[PDB]
Design an enzyme around this catalytic site. Structure first.
Site, short mmCIF file in Angstrom:
data_model
loop_
_atom_site.label_atom_id
_atom_site.label_comp_id
_atom_site.label_asym_id
_atom_site.label_seq_id
_atom_site.Cartn_x
_atom_site.Cartn_y
_atom_site.Cartn_z
N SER A 93 37.05 -54.58 56.47
CA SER A 93 37.71 -53.76 55.45
C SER A 93 37.18 -53.96 54.04
CB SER A 93 39.22 -54.00 55.49
OG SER A 93 39.55 -55.38 55.36
N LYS A 136 48.56 -55.80 52.35
CA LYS A 136 47.58 -55.73 51.27
C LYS A 136 48.16 -55.03 50.05
CE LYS A 136 43.29 -55.49 54.01
NZ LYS A 136 42.71 -54.68 55.08
B1 LIG Z 1 39.84 -56.35 56.41
O1 LIG Z 1 41.11 -56.07 57.07
O2 LIG Z 1 38.83 -56.27 57.42
C1 LIG Z 1 39.70 -57.77 55.67
C2 LIG Z 1 38.29 -57.98 55.11
C3 LIG Z 1 38.12 -59.01 53.97
C4 LIG Z 1 39.14 -58.79 52.85
C5 LIG Z 1 38.24 -60.46 54.45
N1 LIG Z 1 39.87 -58.87 56.62
C6 LIG Z 1 41.04 -59.52 56.69
O3 LIG Z 1 41.95 -59.19 55.95
C7 LIG Z 1 41.16 -60.64 57.71
C8 LIG Z 1 41.15 -61.98 56.98
C9 LIG Z 1 40.68 -63.09 57.88
C10 LIG Z 1 41.00 -64.40 57.58
C11 LIG Z 1 40.57 -65.43 58.39
C12 LIG Z 1 39.82 -65.14 59.52
C13 LIG Z 1 39.50 -63.83 59.83
C14 LIG Z 1 39.93 -62.79 59.01
N2 LIG Z 1 42.40 -60.59 58.47
C15 LIG Z 1 42.53 -60.06 59.70
O4 LIG Z 1 41.60 -59.56 60.29
C16 LIG Z 1 43.87 -60.12 60.32
N3 LIG Z 1 44.90 -60.57 59.60
C17 LIG Z 1 46.11 -60.65 60.11
C18 LIG Z 1 46.31 -60.26 61.41
N4 LIG Z 1 45.29 -59.83 62.13
C19 LIG Z 1 44.07 -59.74 61.63
#
Ligand SMILES: *[B]([O])([O])[C]([C][C]([C])[C])[N]C(=O)[C]([C]C1=[C][C]=[C][C]=[C]1)[N]C(=O)C1=N[C]=[C]N=[C]1
EC number: 3.4.21.53
Length: 195
Positions: A93, A136
């Protein structure tokens, strides 16, 4: 509080979430020297590294159409960092965030202040929906974000929030990176007068 109250060029606010809620983060980019290259740090997972490669390719192409005389992304040695250094991060994202950071660096222009964005970026610049919009958005509101940019197909998730959360938020739902570019850098698309 925020890690940057005022973003210089090459720095853009993104939004993340965990099972523990949402948070803001900043993408940082910079030159490492005066064909180019991108070096990426910040304990990024493999989906996030690939979204940095996609964003790098799109940004090079985008800025060759917007500013063909500007070669900074084609020739420079760039470093991209996502603090904090020890925290693992993954997911697609932050694609648009990375695109915006690279263009901001290459144009030497900061993005609109108090702006956060989230959205997966296609190789042609389509903005694809993402998760954690509710978490978010709450995190953006707590952080003083007044302008939030989100994928158009996440509209229903945004409006699942209570009015007192989204009131005061200027929100833009976008489908192509060009729409983000015009929000992030409003003076590149603004009414002008000759002299
Ligand atoms: B986005 O949603 O892809 C975002 C990209 C960037 C801002 C990091 N990713 C997340 O928000 C991830 C953070 C994360 C933290 C530690 C390890 C892996 C990913 N979060 C998730 O993908 C997620 N969060 C909560 C529940 N499920 C998935």
């Amino acid at each position: 509080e925020r890690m940057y109250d005022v973003t210089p060029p090459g720095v853009v606010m993104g939004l993340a979430w965990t099972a523990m809620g949402g948070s803001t983060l900043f993408v940082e980019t910079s030159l490492r020297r005066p064909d180019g290259s991108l070096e990426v740090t910040g304990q990024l997972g493999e989906v996030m590294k690939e979204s940095a490669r996609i964003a790098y390719t799109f940004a090079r192409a985008f800025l060759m159409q917007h500013a063909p005389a500007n070669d900074y992304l084609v020739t420079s040695h760039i470093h991209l960092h996502v603090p904090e250094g020890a925290t693992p991060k993954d997911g697609p994202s932050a694609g648009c965030t990375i695109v915006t950071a690279l263009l901001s660096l290459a144009m030497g222009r900061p993005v609109r202040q108090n702006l956060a964005m989230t959205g997966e970026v296609s190789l042609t610049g389509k903005i694809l929906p993402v998760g954690g919009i509710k978490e978010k958005t709450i995190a953006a509101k707590r952080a003083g974000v007044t302008c939030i940019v989100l994928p158009a197909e996440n509209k229903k998730d945004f409006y699942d929030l209570a009015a007192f959360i989204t009131e005061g938020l200027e929100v833009h739902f976008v489908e192509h990176y060009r729409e983000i570019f015009d929000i992030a850098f409003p003076d590149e698309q603004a009414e002008a007068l000759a002299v």
